[PDB]
Every structure is written in C-alpha cells, then in structure tokens.
Amino acid sequence: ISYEQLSLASVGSVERLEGKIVGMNPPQFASINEFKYCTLKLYFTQLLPNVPDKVLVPGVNCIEIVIPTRERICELFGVLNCQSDKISDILLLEKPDRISVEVERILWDNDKTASPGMAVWSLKNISTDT
Amino acid sequence: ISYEQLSLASVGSVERLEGKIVGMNPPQFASINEFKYCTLKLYFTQLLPNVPDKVLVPGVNCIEIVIPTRERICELFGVLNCQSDKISDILLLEKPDRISVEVERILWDNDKTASPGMAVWSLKNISTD
C-alpha cells in the first residue's frame, strides 16, 4: 500500500499528497515556545480520513509530517496563531475541506551530535485548497 | 519478528525484545515539565555487529517506544533524573551493553481533543541487566 511504500522513501524524495490532515502532535499547546525541544507533527491520509473509530498508525495508515523548526511553524501559521485550537482551524481538521501537500524526505539531525539523525517527511508546501 | 510485523500488531499485543535504545526524542530536555504536551519517545533496535549504523526510520528500521505520561517518566527514571544527559546515562545509549524491553501495543488517546487515538508501542518493562 501507499503509506507503507512511502515510509521506505529515500532522503531527497519529494511527494505530492492529497487528502486530509486528520491530526496533530502534540494535540494541545499554547504558544510557539512549546516547540523549542518538542516537534510539531501532522497526520495526513486520503484513506477513510472521516471515520470516527479510526486509529491512526503512521507509516501504514497515514503519514507523519514534521514541521522541523519554530521558524518554519511561524512562517506557515504565524506566531500569533500558534495555539492548537487556531492551528486546528487553519488546517481544517474539523471541516471536510481537502488539503494538498508536498512533502520532502529529509535527514533530520536534531540537536548536537544528533539523536541520531532520522529520515522523516517534512512539509515542503501546503495548500488549503482545492 | 520483523519491523513490518511489529507495525501491524493489534492493540494489546505484548513483546519481549532485546537490543539497544539508540536514541530519544526530544534528544535534549531540562526537566519533567517539558513533557506536559510533548511525549518522551525512545528508539529501539538490534545493533550491527561490525557495520554502520545510522539513519533511523521508525517502524521500518527500529521501533519508537513512547513513555505516555509524566507520571510514567518519573516512575521509571525519577523526577530528579529527568534531564536528557542523565536519562542517556540511565539508558546506556553510549555503552555497548544490550538492553531488554517489554513493549505493549496501546491505543494512545490523547486528550480526546478532536484528535484521533494512535496505535503505539508503550514501555511496559525495561531491564539494564
């Protein structure tokens, strides 16, 4: 299936996905300061995004998309909107509106001597249309 | 037990595995309070005898193990020890010594705040032995 095969994608890969953002991690937060150490992750799927009952499983069911820095979070969402209620409305989690994203497979090498580095999907582009 | 089979495990599954905690997320932190919204995750794998070594891809290359609550973090590690440097020492991430973990597939939900639950591996037991 697509998410299992996407999870095998090598660093450098760029994919266009269409569907819905069905969740974020962490699901609650109050300011940009929450993301000094913690990372904002989005969950994306075009497979039964609606069904209540849905148990998300990143890499089989949906993909995890990291927004890697506070600066990138701000660029996309604005520092003034960086509370989970507001990001939720912006990402249309409670609405049927479809989303299109370009994601990029990056080597995400965290802090100093690493964590170590891991391969993750990061948000290249996002359209709240169409 | 392949990683693929581990990614498909039904909620409630328990597994005893041996290998190494090779990293933690977040990889740097100062106190327990950083885990109010953020979740501590550990990365488990079996290590390479005489080879590299490196790019973790959770679910394919290793498993991510979540310690779902602050209460659980303290119970295992101690509120006094909840700094990334101290936990790294406790988890022996810089010694070659093998670790033994028991993980449980849990439905992790999750404030229940227009969120969905996620199936994840939770730390049931760990031995440094």
Instruction: Compute the Cα dihedral for A40, B4, B120, B82 and give only its sign.
Output: negative
Kind plus residue range of the DSSP H or E element containing B15: strand B14-25
Instruction: Compute the Cα dihedral for A116, A120, A124, A129 and give only its sign.
Output: negative
What distance in Å separates residue A130's CA from the closest CA in chain B? 23
Flag if A26 and B34 touch (Cβ within 8 Å): no
Q: How far apart are the C-alpha atoms of A72 and A93, rounded to whole Å?
A: 20
The C-alpha torsion from A60 through B43 and B121 to B27, rounded to 10°, is -100
Annotation: CATH topology of A1-130: OB fold (Dihydrolipoamide Acetyltransferase, E2P) (2.40.50)
Question: CA A116, A118, A121 angle in degrees (round to 5)?
Answer: 155
Q: How far apart are the C-alpha atoms of B50 and B14, rounded to whole Å?
A: 30
Q: What SS3 class is residue A104?
A: strand
Which distant-in-sequence residues (6+ apart) come within 8 Å of A104 by Cβ?
A13, A14, A15, A121, A122, A123, A124
Residue in the block written with tokens 């359209």: A127
Flag if B7 and A88 touch (Cβ within 8 Å): no
Residue in the block written with tokens 């973790």: B56
Nearest to B29 among A37, A55, A60 (CB): A37
Residue A54, chain B, CB below 8 Å: the answer is yes
Q: How far apart are the C-alpha atoms of A25 and B63, rounded to whole Å?
A: 18
Q: How far apart are the C-alpha atoms of B93 and B22, rounded to whole Å?
A: 6
Helix intervals (H) in chain A:
2-6, 70-77, 84-91
Method of determination? X-ray
Q: How far apart are the C-alpha atoms of B20 and B12, rounded to whole Å?
A: 23
Amino acid identity for residue B57 in this structure: V
Q: How far apart are the C-alpha atoms of B106 and B119, rounded to whole Å?
A: 6
To the nearest 10 degrees (0 to 180), the angle between helices B70-77 and B84-91 is 60
Phi-psi sector, A3: left (phi>0), alpha (psi -120 to 50), beta: alpha
Q: In chain B, which residue's Cα lies nearest the Cα of A9?
A: B57
Residues of B in contact with A29 (CB under 8 A): 37
Residue A32, chain B, CB below 8 Å: the answer is no
Q: How far apart are the C-alpha atoms of A93 and B125, rounded to whole Å?
A: 35
Tokens of A22: 């069905």
What's the full length of chain A, in residues?
Answer: 130
Q: How far apart are the C-alpha atoms of A115 and B24, rounded to whole Å?
A: 6
Residues before each break in chain A (C–N > 2.5 Å)? none
Beta carbons of A83 and A56 less than 8 angstroms apart: no
Output Rg (C-alpha) for chain B, integer angstroms: 15
Residue B9, chain A, CB below 8 Å: the answer is no
Kind plus residue range of the DSSP H or E element containing B4: helix B3-7
* Bond before B96 cis per omega within 30 degrees: no
Tokens of A129: 């249309």
Residue B8, chain A, CB below 8 Å: the answer is yes
Residue in the block written with tokens 């994840």: B120
Residue A7, chain B, CB below 8 Å: the answer is yes
To the nearest 10 degrees (0 to 180), the angle between helices A70-77 and A84-91 is 60
Residue A88, chain B, CB below 8 Å: the answer is yes
Q: How far apart are the C-alpha atoms of A83 and A34, rounded to whole Å?
A: 10
Beta carbons of A103 and B10 less than 8 angstroms apart: no
Flag if A26 and B38 touch (Cβ within 8 Å): yes
How crowded is residue A89: how many other Cβ atoms within 10 Å of its Cβ? 12
Q: How far apart are the C-alpha atoms of A123 and B74, rounded to whole Å?
A: 34
Beta carbons of A14 and A34 less than 8 angstroms apart: no
Q: Determine how β-strand B118-127 pairs with β-strand B63-67.
A: parallel
Residue B118, chain A, CB below 8 Å: the answer is yes
Q: How far apart are the C-alpha atoms of A99 and A129, rounded to whole Å?
A: 6
The CATH class that applies to domain B1-129 reads mainly beta
